[PDB]
Amino acid sequence: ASRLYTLVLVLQPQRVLLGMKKRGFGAGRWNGFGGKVQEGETIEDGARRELQEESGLTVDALHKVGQIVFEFVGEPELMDVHVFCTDSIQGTPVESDEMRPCWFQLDQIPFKDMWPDDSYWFPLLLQKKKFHGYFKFQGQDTILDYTLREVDTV
Ligand SMILES: Nc1nc2c([nH]c(=O)n2[C@H]2C[C@H](O)[C@@H](COP(=O)(O)O)O2)c(=O)[nH]1
Q1: Is 50 annotated as a binding residue?
Q2: Dihedral sign of CA atoms 94, 68, 1, 24 in order
Q3: Is 74 in the pocket of ligand 1 (CB under 6 A)?
Q4: 117 annotated among ligand-binding-site residues
């Protein structure tokens, strides 16, 4: 068993929107926006909800671009992260309790202050290739195992 999560990247031709996570899981790493999917909503609806809660933004269309499954050693549930992109945002991003948003140039992505797995799959997002990844972590810094491939259907 696994628990559904979302992750949303606003990727525009020369920049990508990240938020500095201010509290909770992943605090202190830049990331896309997202969270747990709730009972009674779709995954994509949960992705939009979280985008709105964390940034104020709404979007016309979200595209599925990837899936990443995480194992954390000693934790029973795998995390099944559904990754979306958009270039179609509505509004200007604002800081929330969870996130402080900033735009980054595509060659200035702050990998050293991101989850360590992002170094591996982010390039494929940027290159517009759909992927499936799997990372096993010991704590929040150490990747013990991983797999990564491109896919045609996410
Ligand atoms: N880029 C990236 N996002 C992750 C990783 N692990 C992980 O749960 N997430 C995402 C999914 C969700 O958007 C978010 C976790 O949910 P909360 O912020 O609600 O705790 O972090 C990771 O290793 N890298």
Answers
A1: yes
A2: negative
A3: no
A4: yes
Q: Which domains does the chain have, with CATH numbers?
A: 1-154 (3.90.79.10)
CA torsion sign for 121, 57, 48, 113 is positive
Closest Cα to atom 22 of ligand 1:
115
Distance of CA 68 to the CA centre of its chain: 9
Angle at 28 between CA 47 and CA 2, to 5 degrees: 45
d(CA 87, CA 89): 6
**Is the shortest distance between the CB of 71 and ligand 1 below 6 Å?**
no
Q: Evaluate: CB of 122 within 6 angstroms of ligand 1.
A: no
DSSP string, 68-95: EEEEETT-SSEEEEEEEEES-EES----
